[PDB]
Symmetry: C2
Subunit: 199 residues, 2 copies
């Protein structure tokens, strides 16, 4: 029986993930079920809280990435790290990062709303998502759109306390400890193709 | 009376920090004794371990910066990003995803290497180099200058790593949290003001 088989079959893993995100909860994302995979925590920006950001900083690499559509990154006039122009100080606190992220992901945002450089790291998702490119950036934005949420999400790599990166079993264990659905990009590909999801 | 009184007079605080760095231990740095200041953990690159880096990732913002001299930054072709910030960097060899504590140390060692070439490093990456102003803290009172100044003053390889101490709830550690962390971990706490007084007092050009 596969590693993630206890989280259910691929379709179930995706559906549980989408439901968690709709409820404002986070998920864990892997390339596939290979046991040597590293994994990220994902939160929806729509419901992002200071406490969630704080957990990321505590538990992950701390290099927290903001995954955006091409259109939203264009709207911000991004090519580079970013900082909210207003409402923050050193930019690095969990509240400051959330402010910066909320500011950047805002569909009514203007480029001047952000300063550059900063302490939040935006990534552009490829058009087509995981069906075009199997990256965690694509997986993040796809999950938001499939969940019917603001098409922006935050990711950060889960880190073991000794500083090595969490691999699949540690990610599974973390998901169980925090009631976070675990799923894979492979899961998402099977799901999108099966349910004809052009996003 | 002063918030940092426990760590000694300004001159003592600097002497103790230098000694700790000489012994391969880390220190904590603040602008001054003001309560609202946020503080950084500093480690010397020369003696940097996986475990030290893991502590930074675990306890701090995770945006670990590499403070370099101008000479070294130029040796790496790392111009200002847009500012003291440059593009992020990754070791070309000897790493994988580049984000593990070991991989960042590898990247940092490769970058700080006196005999390093710009082509030892891929960009972007997961380590964030910062350019220190010539003159150090006597020219600019930044933590980047503080870090490189401490290394030169301690006689070490002129490169250090810094990261902002972060409380569990995501807020940034201020002077009282910084003092508690320092005592708990046997890490000297000092200020940039301390370093300014010391460098002038002891007529320290560092070049």
């Amino acid at each position: 029986s596969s590693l993630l088989a206890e989280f259910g079959d691929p379709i179930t893993r995706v559906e549980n993930a989408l439901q968690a995100l709709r409820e404002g909860r986070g998920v864990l994302l892997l390339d596939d079920e290979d046991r040597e995979n590293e994994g990220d925590i994902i939160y929806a920006v729509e419901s992002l809280t200071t406490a969630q950001m704080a957990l990321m900083i505590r538990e992950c690499s701390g290099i927290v990435c903001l995954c955006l559509t091409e259109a939203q990154a264009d709207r911000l006039a991004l090519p580079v790290s970013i900082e909210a122009k207003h409402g923050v100080t050193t930019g690095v606190s969990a509240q400051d990062r959330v402010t910066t992220i909320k500011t950047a992901a805002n569909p009514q945002a203007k480029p001047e709303d952000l300063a550059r450089p900063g302490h939040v790291f935006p990534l552009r998702a490829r058009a087509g998502g995981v069906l075009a490119r199997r990256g965690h950036t694509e997986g993040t934005v796809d999950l938001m759109q499939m969940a019917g949420l603001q098409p922006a999400g935050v990711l950060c790599e889960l880190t073991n306390p000794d500083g090595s990166m969490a691999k699949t079993p540690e990610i599974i264990e973390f998901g169980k400890l925090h009631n976070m659905p675990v799923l894979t990009i492979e899961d998402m590909v099977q799901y999108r193709i099966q349910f004809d999801l052009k996003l």
